[PDB]
Amino acid sequence: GSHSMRYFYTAMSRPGRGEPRFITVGYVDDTLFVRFDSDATSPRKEPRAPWIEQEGPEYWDRETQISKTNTQTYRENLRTALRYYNQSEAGSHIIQRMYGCDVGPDGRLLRGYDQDAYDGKDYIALNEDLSSWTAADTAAQITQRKWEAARVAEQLRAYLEGLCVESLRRYLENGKETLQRADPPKTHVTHHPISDHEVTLRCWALGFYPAEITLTWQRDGEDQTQDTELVETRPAGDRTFQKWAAVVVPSGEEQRYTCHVQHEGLPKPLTLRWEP
Amino acid sequence: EEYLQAFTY
Amino acid sequence: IQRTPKIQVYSRHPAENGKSNFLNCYVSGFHPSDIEVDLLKNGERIEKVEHSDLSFSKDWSFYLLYYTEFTPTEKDEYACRVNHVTLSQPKIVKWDRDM
C-alpha cells in the first residue's frame, strides 16, 4: 500500500514554570515509533515500536542530538514569534510543526510536508513543489524572507527526497509484519429502541488498522449523511481503532437501512443490515 | 529519521 | 483561538461482566494542549491511569488517550472527567458499553 512518515513537534511556553517544553513524536502511518520529551528525566529519543529497536547506538545518539538542538531552536522560535506579534511575555504560547513524506507502493516519494503553526493558526508551510513557502501573515513573511535567503527549502527538499524516503523504506521492511499488515474491521449492527416508534441502528467497526475507514448508512440505497451520527475514529490501545455510525429509524423500517463499510483491509466494501 | 533544520524564525 | 475537547469513554474490547478489559478516555480536537483527565470508578478517581504521548491531527488540534485496566460489572459505574481552559467546570462523561 501507500505509506507516510511524520514527525510532530510541540513547543509550549509556560512563563513562571521553566523553559518551554519540547516534545517530538514520530509516526509511520498510524504507528508511533519514537518520542522525545524535554521534560524527561534524561531527555533522549526513545523507541516506541519493536522494529525501531534494531537501529544501532549511533542512530539513537544522532536522533537524540537533533531533538536536543531542536529544543533550543524552538525556544528561540517562541521568543521570536512573541516579538513578531507584539505579544507580552506573560502568556503561554505553542508552536507546532509537522513534516515528512508520503510514498507509494513502489517506495517512491508521493509528496513531502513541512508546516508550522503558531497558537494553532497556520504560520509557514513548504509548498508541494518543495521549493517555495506560504506565509500566513506579515509575521510569517519575515521568516519566509529569512528562509529564502538561507535556502532552507533546498535543504528540506534534499531531506524529503532522500533520507525521509530512504529511512521510511527501511522502517517498512523492518516492521513489515505490522506496518504492512492491514487489519480489517470486525463489524456488527446493534438495535436500540429509543421509544415506541423510533429505534437506533448502530453500525460498529472494531479492531481495524490503519485508522482510515468509511462507515455510511443508506436508506433505500440513498446516503443518509445528514441523519447519521458518526463518532470520531478512536484508538483501542492495542494499535487498532474503532468507529461507529448511528441512524434513528422508524419502527418496522429497519430493513430499508444498510450499513456500508470501506477499509483497506477489505477486498470489497461490506454491506450490513440489522439481523433480528 | 529526522534531519536538523537549524534555521530559526 | 481555543478549541474544546471532544470526549469519548469506551472499552478496548467488547464489555463482558467479570472479564478484565481496558477503560479508555479519548480526548481530541482541543487547543491549547493542557488538559486534565480522570477516569472514575463509582465517582472516585482511579489511581495510576496512564496516557499516550501528546500529538495532534492535521488540523493542529491535540489528542490523548487515557487508559486503565478494569473488570466491568453490572453495578459498577465508570466515567471520564475532563477539564480544559475552554470549560468552566469539569465535564463528566459516563461509560456506556453501547457507545
Same domain, A61 and A196: no
CATH of the domain at A160: 3.30.500.10
Dihedral class, residue A146 (left if φ above 0, else alpha if ψ from -120 to 50, else beta): alpha
Interface of C with A (CB under 8 A): 1, 3, 6, 8, 10, 12-14, 22, 24, 26, 28-29, 31-33, 52-56, 58, 60-62, 65, 67, 98-99
Q: Looking at the structure, tell me whether residues A196 and A131 fall in a common domain.
A: no
Q: Helix (H, G, I), strand (E, B), or coil: what is residue A100?
A: strand
Asked if A97 contacts A116 with a C-beta cutoff of 8 angstroms, the reply is yes
Nearest alpha carbon to residue A235 among C20, C57, C81, B1? C57
**A·C CB contacts under 8 A:** 68
Alpha carbon of A234: minimum distance to chain C alpha carbons (Å): 7
Alpha helices by DSSP H, A117-274: 138-149, 152-161, 163-174, 176-179
User: For chain A, how long is the longest CA-to-CA vector?
Assistant: 70
* Same domain (yes/no): A159, A200: no
Residue A216 CA to residue A206 CA, distance in Å, equals 15
One-letter amino acid identity for A39? D
Q: In chain B, which residue's Cα lies nearest the Cα of A99?
A: B2
Q: Dihedral, CA atoms, A71, A73, A77, A78, nearest 10 degrees?
A: 20
Q: Which region, left, alpha or beta, applies to residue C42 given φ > 0 means left and ψ of -120 to 50 means alpha?
A: left
Query: Do the Cβ atoms of A115 and A59 come closer than 8 Å?
Result: no
User: Which residue segment(s) compose the domain that A55 sits in?
Assistant: 1-181
- Apex A148 CA angle, A146 and A151, nearest 5: 110
Name residue A7's amino acid. Y
Cell numbers describing residue A136: 500566513
CB contact under 8 A, A67 and B5: no
Write out the DSSP string of A3-57: EEEEEEEEEE--TTSSSPEEEEEEEETTEEEEEEETTSSS---EE-SGGGTTS-H
> Measured between beta carbons, which residues in chain B are less than 8 angstroms from residue A80?
8-9
Q: Using only C-alpha atoms, what is the Rg of chain B?
A: 8
Structural contact between residues A59 and A42, judged by C-beta atoms closer than 8 angstroms: no
The answer to whether the Cβ–Cβ distance between A163 and B5 falls below 8 Å is: no
CATH number of C3's domain: 2.60.40.10
Write the CATH number for A186: 2.60.40.10
In chain C, the number of structural domains is: 1
A62 and A21 in one domain? yes
H-helix segments, chain A: 57-84, 138-149, 152-161, 163-174, 176-179
Residue type, position A182, single letter: A
CA distances in angstroms from A259 to A33, A198, A231, A265, A274, listed in the order given: 34, 18, 15, 17, 9
User: Residue A207: phi, psi to the nearest 5?
Assistant: 75, 20
Residue A15 identity: P
- Apex CA A210: angle with CA A209 and CA A212, to 5°? 120
Number of C-alpha atoms within 13 angstroms, CB side, residue A132? 2
A208 shares its domain with A233? yes
Chains touching B, CB cut-off 8 Å, 3+ pairs: A
Q: Quick one: A10 and A137 in the same domain? A: yes
Domain that holds residue C50: 1-99
Question: Using only C-alpha atoms, what is the Rg of chain A?
Answer: 23
Structure solved via:
X-ray
